[PDB]
């Protein structure tokens, strides 16, 4: 993480026979690697792009190339439902244990 | 376990859901898949040398 020059690394990545690339890193690291890939024609056709939640947004979202297919969790922020379900499960566990 | 995810297709810097992962399968939506290089047809990444 936080490397300043991995252009050659993406070069041997393109040296590989396959044309499928997948990423898992931090927001800033993803932004840097997206900049490197865009400046080295690594975002071209054929190179399908699948990435994780940590890099479909944040700093990398600006330099995100076209055609990115991202994933996310539905209602991953609505805390009221989360805490209600947690209260339900913990109360059920406490009741069943003390019984 | 069995978390149901959703997949987003970057349609001109926009958030569009093109499928839901039901925990065992990814059922896609009607929207086409926008691929890198501005393509809507599926590229297969196994090109020979």
């Amino acid at each position, epitope marked *: 993480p936080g490397t300043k020059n991995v252009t050659a690394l993406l070069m041997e990545a393109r040296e590989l026979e396959a044309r499928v690339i997948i990423l898992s890193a931090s*927001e800033d690291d993803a932004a840097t690697v997206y900049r490197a890939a*865009a400046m080295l024609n690594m975002t071209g056709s054929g190179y399908v792009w699948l990435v994780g939640e940590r890099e479909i947004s*944040g*700093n990398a979202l*600006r330099y995100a190339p*076209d055609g990115i297919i991202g994933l996310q969790l539905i209602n991953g*922020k*609505n805390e009221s439902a989360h805490i209600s379900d947690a209260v339900g499960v913990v109360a059920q566990a406490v009741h069943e244990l003390l019984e | 376990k069995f978390a149901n995810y959703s997949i987003m297709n970057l349609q*001109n*810097r926009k958030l569009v859901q093109v499928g839901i992962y039901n925990g065992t399968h990814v059922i896609p939506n009607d929207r086409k898949i926008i691929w890198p290089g501005g393509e809507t047809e599926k590229p297969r990444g196994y090109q020979m040398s």
Partner: antibody
Framework: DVQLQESGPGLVKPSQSLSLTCTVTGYSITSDYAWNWIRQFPGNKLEWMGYISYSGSTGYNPSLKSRISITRDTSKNQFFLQLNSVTTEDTATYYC????????????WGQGTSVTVS | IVLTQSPASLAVSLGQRATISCKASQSVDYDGNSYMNWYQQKPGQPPKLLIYAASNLESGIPARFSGSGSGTDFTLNIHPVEEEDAATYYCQQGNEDPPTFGGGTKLEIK
């Protein structure tokens, strides 16, 4: 629907720090995003000061970072712009706008508040 | 490194195309994408984003507004034109720092 409101002291006795308040009701505050401060002069021209996300990323002008403070209030998660000195003559309008990341999509805009530098 | 809009007070009539030239000194086009935004304003009125990317439809307004060009030059094309379009229109880049104001040309009606 999602609503936002901007307010501030505007003008009190001189040699003080403006704390312009921006908040959003009807929507989550700290999921993703860009939050930009915008300054406009009655000469009909715009310019940029700074952006803050929920990602924690911040970005400001190198020449304007001297007396700008972006502070948190947690009870509703509203953000405050602290800047020194308020007057009347240098009447300019200020906006707080949440927007799609990358300075790309200006989803929302501010209503404008009277801030002066003189 | 100046960014301009042409012209400040242009002749705008009804039915034809209106050409606003957003000249940005920098090379906007990044990885095949030119980050343009066009928005309207009135003095003291909250701005509202009219069109984004110059080629993607904005929800609420038909194809009367569009944007062409590349790199150094861009063009807001109003085809056709209506009467209430009289406002301070601003073109804004979105590639990277610096976020630079456009000409903010005001649309006058003949």
């Amino acid at each position: 629907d999602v609503q936002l409101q901007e307010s501030g002291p505007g003008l009190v006795k001189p040699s003080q720090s403006l704390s312009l308040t921006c908040t959003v009701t009807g929507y989550s505050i700290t999921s993703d995003y860009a939050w930009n401060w915008i300054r406009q002069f009655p000469g009909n021209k715009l310019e940029w000061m700074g952006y803050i996300s929920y990602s924690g990323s911040t970005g400001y002008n190198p020449s304007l970072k001297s007396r700008i403070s972006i502070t948190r209030d947690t009870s509703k998660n509203q953000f405050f712009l602290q800047l020194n000195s308020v007057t009347t003559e240098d009447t300019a309008t200020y906006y707080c706008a949440r927007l799609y990341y990358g300075f790309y999509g200006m989803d929302y805009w501010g209503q404008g508040t009277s801030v002066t530098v003189s | 490194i100046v960014l301009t809009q042409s012209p400040a007070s242009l002749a705008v009539s009804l039915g034809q195309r209106a050409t606003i030239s957003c000249k940005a000194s920098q090379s906007v086009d990044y990885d095949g994408n030119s980050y343009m935004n066009w928005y309207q304003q009135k003095p003291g009125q909250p701005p509202k984003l009219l069109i984004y990317a110059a080629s993607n439809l904005e929800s609420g307004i038909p194809a009367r507004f569009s944007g062409s060009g590349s790199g150094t030059d861009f063009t807001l094309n109003i085809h056709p034109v209506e009467e209430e379009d009289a406002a301070t229109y601003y073109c804004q880049q979105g590639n990277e720092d610096p976020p630079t104001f456009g000409g903010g040309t005001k649309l006058e009606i003949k």
